[PDB]
Design an enzyme around this catalytic site. Structure first.
Site, PDB file in Angstrom:
ATOM      1  N   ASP A  18      -7.580   0.813   8.202  1.00  0.00           N
ATOM      2  CA  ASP A  18      -6.290   0.183   8.437  1.00  0.00           C
ATOM      3  C   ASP A  18      -6.034   0.001   9.941  1.00  0.00           C
ATOM      4  OD1 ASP A  18      -5.690   0.348   5.576  1.00  0.00           O
ATOM      5  OD2 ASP A  18      -5.009   2.407   5.955  1.00  0.00           O
ATOM      6  N   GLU A 229      -0.253  -6.355   0.368  1.00  0.00           N
ATOM      7  CA  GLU A 229       0.010  -5.317   1.362  1.00  0.00           C
ATOM      8  C   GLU A 229      -0.533  -5.769   2.734  1.00  0.00           C
ATOM      9  OE1 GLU A 229      -3.893  -2.730  -0.120  1.00  0.00           O
ATOM     10  OE2 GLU A 229      -1.920  -1.811  -0.227  1.00  0.00           O
TER      11      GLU A 229
HETATM   12  O1  LIG Z   1      -0.970   0.954  -3.097  1.00  0.00           O
HETATM   13  C1  LIG Z   1      -2.318   0.502  -3.215  1.00  0.00           C
HETATM   14  C2  LIG Z   1      -2.905   0.916  -4.562  1.00  0.00           C
HETATM   15  O2  LIG Z   1      -2.197   0.302  -5.655  1.00  0.00           O
HETATM   16  C3  LIG Z   1      -4.361   0.476  -4.631  1.00  0.00           C
HETATM   17  O3  LIG Z   1      -4.938   0.931  -5.868  1.00  0.00           O
HETATM   18  C4  LIG Z   1      -6.139   0.267  -6.245  1.00  0.00           C
HETATM   19  C5  LIG Z   1      -5.873  -0.573  -7.498  1.00  0.00           C
HETATM   20  O4  LIG Z   1      -7.105  -0.996  -8.086  1.00  0.00           O
HETATM   21  C6  LIG Z   1      -8.031   0.066  -8.334  1.00  0.00           C
HETATM   22  O5  LIG Z   1      -9.240  -0.436  -8.926  1.00  0.00           O
HETATM   23  C7  LIG Z   1      -8.435   0.744  -7.053  1.00  0.00           C
HETATM   24  O6  LIG Z   1      -9.403   1.758  -7.335  1.00  0.00           O
HETATM   25  C8  LIG Z   1      -7.223   1.349  -6.395  1.00  0.00           C
HETATM   26  O7  LIG Z   1      -7.574   1.840  -5.098  1.00  0.00           O
HETATM   27  O8  LIG Z   1      -5.117   1.032  -3.540  1.00  0.00           O
HETATM   28  C9  LIG Z   1      -4.658   0.592  -2.268  1.00  0.00           C
HETATM   29  C10 LIG Z   1      -3.207   1.043  -2.098  1.00  0.00           C
HETATM   30  O9  LIG Z   1      -2.730   0.612  -0.833  1.00  0.00           O
HETATM   31  O1  FUB Z   2      -5.244   3.021   3.306  1.00  0.00           O
HETATM   32  C1  FUB Z   2      -4.065   3.387   2.617  1.00  0.00           C
HETATM   33  C2  FUB Z   2      -3.408   2.115   2.160  1.00  0.00           C
HETATM   34  O2  FUB Z   2      -4.345   1.307   1.418  1.00  0.00           O
HETATM   35  C3  FUB Z   2      -4.326   0.008   1.952  1.00  0.00           C
HETATM   36  O3  FUB Z   2      -5.443  -0.148   2.851  1.00  0.00           O
HETATM   37  C4  FUB Z   2      -2.962  -0.054   2.627  1.00  0.00           C
HETATM   38  O4  FUB Z   2      -2.833  -1.153   3.484  1.00  0.00           O
HETATM   39  C5  FUB Z   2      -2.863   1.286   3.319  1.00  0.00           C
HETATM   40  O5  FUB Z   2      -1.536   1.698   3.754  1.00  0.00           O
END
Ligand SMILES: O[C@@H]1[C@@H](O)[C@H](O[C@@H]2CO[C@@H](O)[C@H](O)[C@H]2O)OC[C@H]1O
Ligand code: FUB
Ligand code: NA
Ligand code: NA
Length: 330
Positions: A18, A229
């Protein structure tokens, strides 16, 4: 040893993610997450991202030696925070440095706090409470040419932005994803003008409208283009560039507008998908070249939660379009 010449990891002694890059005091300062192999349960709310501190990095040149300035902020010293120190950013005003950071409070609600230093390298003293009216994750604090500073923020799914439509948290049993109305406009990232003292918002939080080339809102079902995000703001040729991650489609994309608040018109892809699920970047000008800082899961052999930051040159065309970067081609 110098680093950053052929998209190799900028540091390898810790895992880093990040990257938010700034030019302070003629040096590149990078404010990344410090990934650790916490071993916590993996799920769509991101509980596997269980980071606990921040290290500030700096470079005098690109390529160049990368300095790790130690622990700049530790979650145990943030009075309001319970867990999860996610993607941070920094700003500089009137000789003070401000670190903005998302963390879960003690009710497991993401908020954004600030910590203060006299150096871009930290360490930083956190304020005792988070910023009033803040929520969700991924702050980007942008200094405009007129000296106004704006915080862009938000993240859906695990970032909880979808639980904030009323200005109050909808609860832990509310949507785990988005509005669940794919034919409605997608959720937009948030913006607020910062207070003069940089510790609070100067207005009610606004939502940013992102539209397609026809002027129609990007829809909730359009996962290739809609905000997930990692908002970032930069300016080129007087135009405002809102860039961001699309999450489950793994792109960094960008949209352009004529003022901080938008609306922003979707233009195209900045960065194609990387190794590992997340994709998080920043765009910064240094010595008259533009750079894309980003991360991947290459150093850990593909573990989504153990990342490393990288950098490459970014090319704007004079018409304001940006050339798409594919991470593993050259
Ligand atoms: O808030 C974010 C999470 O919702 C995100 O979660 C991902 C969703 O898809 C899955 O297959 C992944 O394994 C999982 O990491 O992760 C990033 C976070 O910023
Ligand atoms: O790395 C933690 C979270 O996942 C995504 O990279 C997001 O932008 C960050 O805040
Ligand atoms: Na960002
Ligand atoms: Na393109």
């Amino acid at each position: 040893v110098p680093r950053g010449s052929h998209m190799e990891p900028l540091v390898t002694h810790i895992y880093t993610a990040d990257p938010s890059a700034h030019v302070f005091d003629g040096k590149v300062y990078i404010y990344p997450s410090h990934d650790i192999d916490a071993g916590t349960p993996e799920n769509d709310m991101g509980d596997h991202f269980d980071m606990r501190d921040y290290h500030v990095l700096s470079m005098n040149s690109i390529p160049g030696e990368v300095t790790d300035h130690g622990v700049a902020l530790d979650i145990k010293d943030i009075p309001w925070a319970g867990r999860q120190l996610w993607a941070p950013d920094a700003a500089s005003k009137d000789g003070k440095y401000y670190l903005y950071f998302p963390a879960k409070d003690k009710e497991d609600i993401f908020r954004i706090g600030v910590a203060v230093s006299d150096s871009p390298a930290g360490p930083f003293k956190p304020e005792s409470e988070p910023i009033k009216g803040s929520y969700s994750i991924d702050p980007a604090v942008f200094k405009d040419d007129d000296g106004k500073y704006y915080m862009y923020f938000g993240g859906i799914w695990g970032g909880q932005l979808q639980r904030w439509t009323t200005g109050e948290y909808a609860g832990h049993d509310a949507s785990k994803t988005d509005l669940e109305q794919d034919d409605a406009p997608a959720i937009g990232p948030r913006i607020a003008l910062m207070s003069d003292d940089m510790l609070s918002f100067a207005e009610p939080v606004k939502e940013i409208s992102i539209v397609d080339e026809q002027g129609n809102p990007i829809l909730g079902g359009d996962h290739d283009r809609r905000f997930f995000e990692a908002a970032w703001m930069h300016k080129y040729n007087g135009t405002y560039y809102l860039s961001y991650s699309t999450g489950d489609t793994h792109y960094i994309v960008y949209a352009t507008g004529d003022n901080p608040y938008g609306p922003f018109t979707y233009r195209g892809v900045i960065l194609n998908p990387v190794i590992g699920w997340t994709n998080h970047h920043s765009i910064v000008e240094f010595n008259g070249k533009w750079y894309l800082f980003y991360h991947d899961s290459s150093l850990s052999g593909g573990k989504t939660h153990l990342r490393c930051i990288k950098v490459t040159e970014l090319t704007h065309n004079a018409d304001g379009t940006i050339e798409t970067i594919s991470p593993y081609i050259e």
